[PDB]
Structures are given as C-alpha cells and as structure tokens.
Amino acid sequence: LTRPDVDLVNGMFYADGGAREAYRWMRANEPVFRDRNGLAAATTYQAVLDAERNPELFSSTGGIRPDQPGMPYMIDMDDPQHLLRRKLVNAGFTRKRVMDKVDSIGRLCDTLIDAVCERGECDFVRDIAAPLPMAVIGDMLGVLPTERDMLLKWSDDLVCGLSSHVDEAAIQKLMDTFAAYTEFTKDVITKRRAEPTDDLFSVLVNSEVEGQRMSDDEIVFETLLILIGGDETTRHTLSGGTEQLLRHRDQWDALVADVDLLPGAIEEMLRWTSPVKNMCRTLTADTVFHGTELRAGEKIMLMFESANFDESVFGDPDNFRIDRNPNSHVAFGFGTHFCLGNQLARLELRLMTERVLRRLPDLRLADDAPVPLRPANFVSGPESMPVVFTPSAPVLAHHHH
C-alpha cells in the first residue's frame, strides 16, 4: 500500500523478486510512474500500447536505454530510416527462411542434450538454455562453432554491465568488451568485402544505406544488435519458462503427454518470463499521458513485464497457465520495432522444449529453492538452474555420429 521507493535503472529491482508487487502498485495508483530519480515509466498494458502506436510522439531516436544516447542501429531509429534498415535484414527472417532451419536447429538441440543426457543432471541455463540460441544466431552470422563461446561471453559482459549498481570495473569491462567486438567486426569487414558469403554478417558488411556503404560504426552496432537480440533473450524464456512448467507439474505432465499443447505453453512462457524488461522512448513534445505530465526530451520506460501482468487485460495474470487463451502478451514489443526475431525465437523455444519434454520426461529442479536472477536492468532471467532426470540415450551420438 506504500509507494515503491525504487530506481528503475538499478538491476537489483529486476532480480530480488519485488518487481511484480511494485508493478501492481504502479498499475493501480500511478500508471505512468516516476521513480525516485524522476524517471518516467509506462506500467499498464494500455499505456505501453498507446506509446508504441504513436512513434511520432514517443520517438526511438533518443536511445533505447535510460542513460545512453541514440546509437547507429535500427532500434534507435524512426521510420522511414528504421525501415531502410529492416529491409536490409528482412530476407534472412522471413517465415519460410526461419522454417527452413527446423532440421538445423533440431540437430543443435539434440547435440546439446546428447552432451548431458547420460549424466542424469545438468545446469539447465548453462548447458541448454544459453547455448542453443547462441549457436542458432551464430550460424546465421557465419560464426564458427569454436568462437560461439567467445561471442556469448562478450554478449554476457555487455548486458550484465547494464545497471546503476555495478562498479567501475564492470563498466570498464563493458567498454573493453565493446572495443573487442569492434575489432572483431573490423576483421570481418575486411574479409567479407573481399570474400562475401551468404551469412548475415557478410550481407550487412556489403549493404547500402542512402546511396553509400553502411558505415563501419553502423555495421558494428547492427550486427551487435542482432547478436544480442539472438543470444540474451530466448535463453531466459527457455530457462525461466521451463522452471514454471516444473513448478506446475500438472502442466509439465500435460505437455509430456500431448505435444500439441506446446505452442500455447510457449506463449505463456514468453508472457511470464518477459526477458526484455524495458525499452525507452523519447518524448518529442510536452504531454499529459495516463495521468502524468511528460516533458519533451525526457525518456519514458516501456515496462513490458509490468504490462504482461496487467490484471485488466489478462484477468488472472499471476497464475501461470499453459492453457491461457487468448494470450496477448507484449514480450516482443509492438508496432514499428516489433521483434525482428520473434518467429525465430518461437521456433527455438518449440524445437528445444519438445526435445526436453521427450528425452528428459522426468526432469525436475535439483532443489526447490529460488532460481537466482541476473541483477541487470535491461534483459534478465535465471543465472543458473540445476536439474535432475533419469539418464537417457543420445540421439545423434551412437546413431552414426
């Protein structure tokens, strides 16, 4: 009943378990909430949707993060400039192109589960949830298998440095990582200008914007956007979502018995986990918006998890239900910047989860104590997730490789 006293840039807010109740207060008492530093946040589903549908008033050019300026990639652009960029990568993400990866992504899933299935235990995050989407986006970007871990670690070091509570060492680590990734990209630019390939990094390297080659800086940021979108998101729905299924074993059981229930489960896994906690918009004019006066140039945080637990929309949002139908979550955002990879992400979730259900049917949490969350203010989900299961046979290994 007391107003939350919070810093929405503090990663701890998103990790310590108190967000859900804080959101509830906001949605009921101050839909457009200003935190203790005065940072405005849209907390109701309707307020998020209203902001999303009016990009003219709620611009993306100011920078998607609350404490950083606009950067040279598509998510920090408004149309038509934004669309110019989407058209450069869209062909790689058509539904047909995504569905043609079923066999490939399936083998990655089977490979990872092969690695642990005979053990009777693994960490669901480290061994399953994190590596699969990394490999998938890596494959699209031409990344070699032995370099996946390097890029994944870089990605982790960038998004974990996103918090007002981290020390100068973490910030330095963030800068050094970005410089390392920059040098990586410069090598790729030189190589793919001379020897273009069919992968997405090569396509971006040789792409054109407004009559000229995409700039070096823009190539760095566009490729990095795709990499992080790929490897710091789906992982949290896989881990956090599977956790909810294991904690609602009736629902786990229904899924093990009927895979036709999996698509509905995936949407609830998405709604619940809401990997992207927020995205910023920049007001282009003074306005009053759902009870709060906003000023031009100020940013507002679109609070997607808060929106995804809006009682007025979902009825019973605090119940995890794989039978939730319809399920109009905004885990992928809405409108202009609606997630490029959302179909890829849904496929990853489907192909991996169906294999887990199938090959590890008696999976369960190793302990029932809290699954720790990453204290970061942007993307966040489970840090680790010990699980146990009856050992089972590999599907690739022992069956002719």
Ligand code: HEM
């Ligand atoms: C569960 C997985 C994912 C979640 C929850 C998620 C969430 C989001 C959200 C909330 C946005 C911003 C939309 C808005 O502001 O309205 C976004 C944008 C974006 N995402 Fe995803 N995403 C996921 C997976 C992916 C994957 C796998 C990729 C790439 C392979 C990707 C690439 C992008 C890109 C490029 C954008 C910018 C789109 C634009 O500005 O047009 N995302 N995502």
Ligand SMILES: CC(C)CCC[C@@H](C)[C@H]1CC[C@H]2[C@@H]3CC=C4C[C@@H](OS(=O)(=O)O)CC[C@]4(C)[C@H]3CC[C@]12C
């Ligand atoms: C999840 C997906 C849809 C969005 C992913 C967005 C990522 C790619 C953004 C979020 C936060 C961003 C960083 C914010 C802050 C900085 C500091 C900046 O250093 S500065 O000296 O140029 O200010 C360099 C870019 C960098 C590292 C950004 C890289 C790019 C960055 C990781």
